[PDB]
Amino acid sequence: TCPFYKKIPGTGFTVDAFQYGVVEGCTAYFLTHFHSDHYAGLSKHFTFPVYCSEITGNLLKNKLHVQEQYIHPLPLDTECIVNGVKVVLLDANHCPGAVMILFYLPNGTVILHTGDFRADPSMERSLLADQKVHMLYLDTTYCSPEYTFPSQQEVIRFAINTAFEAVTLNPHALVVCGTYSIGKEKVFLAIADVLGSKVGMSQEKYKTLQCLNIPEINSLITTDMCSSLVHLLPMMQINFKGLQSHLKKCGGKYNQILAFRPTGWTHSNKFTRIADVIPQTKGNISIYGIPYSEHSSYLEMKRFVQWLKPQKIIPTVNVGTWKSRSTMEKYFREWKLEAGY
Ligand SMILES: CN1CCN(c2nc3ccccc3s2)CC1
Ligand code: NI
């Protein structure tokens, strides 16, 4: 059964609620983004209206084979009426196609649902500017002060400089990058750009990327592995065994692998600066864990919420334990007392 924090009161709407069968009273199902925990339950047999971004709709049609008659893409930054209620989709700064949803309820209440997001000061100059928001359904993934990590720009500078140095020292080195979902494409695109290569990948991953409206994508990616010196592999293969096995398949073209595992936050962020990050190495294979996050840091989350000044916050992540709920509630109250709302 569908939990309370996925229902929008005063409407027939749910958000990211496809794994609960027919939700009683639901006339429109919104999907914030194409990540499996959020789309869980969708398929070609789904027969209710789904509202989403254009990019999310391309993935629904081509990857999940949802019938076109049920896919309702909406443009961003545009007031739309859905089943008698005004809504707006805003860019979430998460993965491609990810949105936040503003709902203007018939009674005058305004609700913002962030979906998954990485809060940024640029959101302060979206259509949110000077918009009173009564209720905030908040991506609380990293809602504790220990969760620190660098900017995406800093992480990409590290990855580009590391890959360029390694391949310039050894032109027979291969670069490999792990993936298990959409998101974090800048990691492999930026490395391939500095090396003068297309990114090589499976047919299935190529299909996924073809759905993402990335400018000049045909110039950047390929299924011809032999033509490419930056390869994408499943995240599960980014280990010494998996990479040794891959190197064997490359027909003596390469004698070294440099691999990247984009993660979220890890406990080494409590000790080691991005500049000082070192790999794990065995023989001619080295593996870097890089903290490329598509969720708000604690500090980014706190700034956004203190700017927005919501009357009530409903967490959508870390909801399952009393300890995590109590921790989040304590921070919301600190933030409110500090800023005066
Ligand atoms: C059994 N543990 C319960 C507490 N835990 C977390 N609490 C929060 C709160 C806010 C952000 C993240 C977390 S993780 C870890 C698991
Ligand atoms: Ni997500």
Answer whether 99's CB lies under 8 Å from 123's CB. no
Provide CB contacts within 8 A for 14, sequence distance 6+. 2, 6, 7, 8, 23, 26, 29, 30
CA-to-CA distance for 277 and 313, rounded, in angstroms?
36
> Using a 6 Å cutoff on CB, does residue 321 contact ligand 1?
yes
Provide CB contacts within 8 A for 48, sequence distance 6+. 22, 26, 28, 29, 70
Answer whether 234's CB lies under 8 Å from 179's CB. yes
> Using a 6 Å cutoff on CB, does residue 284 contact ligand 1?
no
Q: How many angstroms separate the Cα of 329 from the Cα of each of 163, 305, 332, 339?
A: 43, 13, 5, 16
Of the ligands numbered here, which is closest to the C-alpha atom of 118?
A: 2
- Resolution for this experimental structure (Å): 1.2
For residue 260, how many other CB atoms are within 10 A of its CB? 26
Atom of ligand 1 nearest to the CA of 327: 9
Amino acid at 162: T
CA-to-CA distance for 20 and 271, rounded, in angstroms?
42
Of the ligands numbered here, which is closest to the C-alpha atom of 295?
A: 2
CA-to-CA distance for 95 and 100, rounded, in angstroms?
12
| CATH code, 1-147+296-341 | 3.60.15.10
Cα-to-chain-centroid distance, residue 162: 24
Report CA(297)–ligand 1 centroid distance (Å). Answer: 15
Domain ranges of the chain: 1-147+296-341, 148-295
Record the tokens describing residue 154, joined without a space: 């800093």
> Using a 6 Å cutoff on CB, does residue 239 contact ligand 1?
no
Secondary structure class of 221 (helix, strand, coil): strand
For residue 270, how many other CB atoms are within 10 A of its CB? 10
Secondary structure class of 99 (helix, strand, coil): strand
CA-to-CA distance for 39 and 19, rounded, in angstroms?
8
Concatenating the DSSP letter of every residue in 154-217 gives HHHHHHHHHHHHHHHH-TTEEEEEEESSS--HHHHHHHHHHHT-PEE--HHHHHHHHTS--TTG
Answer whether 179's CB lies under 8 Å from 206's CB. no
CA-to-CA distance for 131 and 165, rounded, in angstroms?
48
Report CA(103)–ligand 1 centroid distance (Å). Answer: 29
Report CA(144)–ligand 1 centroid distance (Å). Answer: 8
Does residue 21 come out as left (phi exceeding 0), alpha (psi in the -120 to 50 range) or beta? left
Residue 262: how many CA atoms within 13 Å on its side-chain side?
26
Residue ranges of the alpha helices (H) in the chain? 36-39, 54-62, 152-169, 185-195, 203-210, 240-248, 298-308, 322-339
Question: In testing the pocket of ligand 1, which one of 321, 334, 335 has its CB within 8 Å of the most ligand atoms?
Answer: 321
DSSP 83: T
CA-to-CA distance for 27 and 144, rounded, in angstroms?
36
Q: How many angstroms separate the Cα of 231 from the Cα of each of 172, 178, 202, 225, 306?
A: 14, 9, 9, 7, 42
> Using a 6 Å cutoff on CB, does residue 264 contact ligand 1?
no
Say what the alpha-carbon torsion angle 75, 77, 80, 83 is, to the nearest 10 degrees.
Answer: 90
Amino acid at 307: W
How big is the CA angle at 301 (ends 101 and 134), to the nearest 5 degrees? 45
Answer whether 256's CB lies under 8 Å from 228's CB. no
Residue appearing with tokens 């008698």 = 84
> Using a 6 Å cutoff on CB, does residue 328 contact ligand 1?
yes
| CATH code, 148-295 | 3.40.50.12650
Phi, psi of 44 (to 5 degrees): -65, -15
Provide CB contacts within 8 A for 63, sequence distance 6+. 34, 207, 208, 211
